[PDB]
Design a protein around this ligand. Structure first.
Ligand SMILES: [Mg+2]
Length: 242
């Protein structure tokens, strides 16, 4: 409980909450498969950022998390890499069937953030496959794609979905996607999402979970409004600030 604070102070990591898992200074010690480690080098990513150092082990242990981190902090790997791992184990335990809804869900304010994060997921998923792991399937639920097209992407079952709140809500209400097996919900740029009026749509999306989920909220800012929303959204979260 003693050296971990030295790690944190050095990399300017502020944490709140109980039973915080130890920070980890290397991707290998976070027990990632080598195909992912190679993907990281191959993208020039040799060393974990502060948000990754404390964030990844927090997520891996199943804790809810509030991440106060900015665009460019490396936050995207914090919420993409662990769920890919989670999905990989589920698919190995029981291969996903044709319509089995998403296991992991990532909600973004905008179409372009959604595509970009979806793009990242498909990169790591592809490297796993090229190591003989099964294909994990990543779906986009954003505006500008038809209904037909949306149902096409998920006909094979979907492990991970990246959505904007409006389109996802509509699909849930129309029973075209289900959250019956969704165990992981990441909220990216939550501050922006609140500023844009998506609060209600997101609370509605919440009501489509039957039973526990791990929830993650990422926000560049933590004013009183985001703080109250986070308290209602998450369960005993570890708060991590860089
Ligand atoms: Mg961002």
């Amino acid at each position: 409980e003693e050296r971990h604070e030295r790690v944190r102070k050095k990399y300017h990591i502020l944490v709140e909450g109980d039973g915080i898992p130890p920070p980890i200074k290397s991707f290998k010690e976070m027990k990632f498969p080598a195909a992912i480690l190679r993907g990281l080098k191959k993208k020039g990513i040799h060393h974990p950022t502060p948000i990754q150092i404390q964030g990844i082990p927090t997520i891996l242990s199943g804790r809810d998390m509030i991440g106060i981190a900015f665009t460019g902090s490396g936050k995207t790997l914090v919420f993409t890499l662990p769920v890919i791992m989670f999905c990989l184990e589920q698919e190995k335990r029981l291969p996903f069937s044709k319509r089995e809804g998403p296991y992991g869900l990532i909600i973004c304010p905008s179409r372009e953030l959604a595509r970009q994060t979806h793009g990242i997921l498909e990169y790591y998923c592809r490297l796993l496959q090229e190591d003989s792991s099964p294909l994990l399937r990543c779906a986009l639920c954003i505006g500008g794609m038809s209904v037909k097209e949306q149902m096409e992407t998920i006909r094979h079952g979907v492990h991970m979905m990246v959505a904007t709140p409006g389109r996802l809500m509509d699909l849930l209400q129309k029973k075209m996607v289900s959250l019956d097996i969704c165990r992981y919900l990441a909220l990216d740029e939550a501050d922006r999402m609140i500023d844009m009026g998506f609060e209600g749509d997101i609370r509605t999306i919440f009501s489509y979970f039957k039973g526990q989920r791990q929830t993650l909220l990422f926000s560049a800012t933590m004013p009183k409004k985001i703080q109250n929303f986070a308290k209602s959204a998450l369960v005993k979260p570890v708060t991590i600030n860089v």
